[PDB]
Amino acid sequence: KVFGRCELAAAMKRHGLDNYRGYSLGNWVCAAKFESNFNTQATNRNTDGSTDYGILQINSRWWCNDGRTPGSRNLCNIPCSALLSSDITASVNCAKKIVSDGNGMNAWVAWRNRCKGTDVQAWIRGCRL
Annotated binding residue at 87?
no
**What is the set of active-site residues?**
35, 52
Asked how this structure was determined, the answer is X-ray
For the four alpha carbons of 109, 112, 115 and 121, in that order, the dihedral sign comes to positive
24-29 LR contacts (CB < 8 Å, sep 24+): 24/120, 24/121, 25/124, 25/129, 26/120, 26/121, 26/122, 26/123, 26/124, 27/105, 27/111, 27/115, 27/120, 28/95, 29/5, 29/120, 29/123, 29/124
- Domain chopping of the chain, boundaries: 1-129
Q: What is the dihedral of CA 22, 24, 84, 72, to 10 degrees?
A: -20
Does domain 1-129 fall under CATH 1.10.530.10? My reply is yes
Q: What single DSSP character describes residue 39?
A: B
Residue burial 76-112, b: 16+ Cβ < 10 Å; e: rest: bebbbebbbeeebebbbbbbbbbbeeeeebebbebbe
Three-state DSSP at 93 gives: helix
* Enclosing H/E stretch for 58: strand 58-59
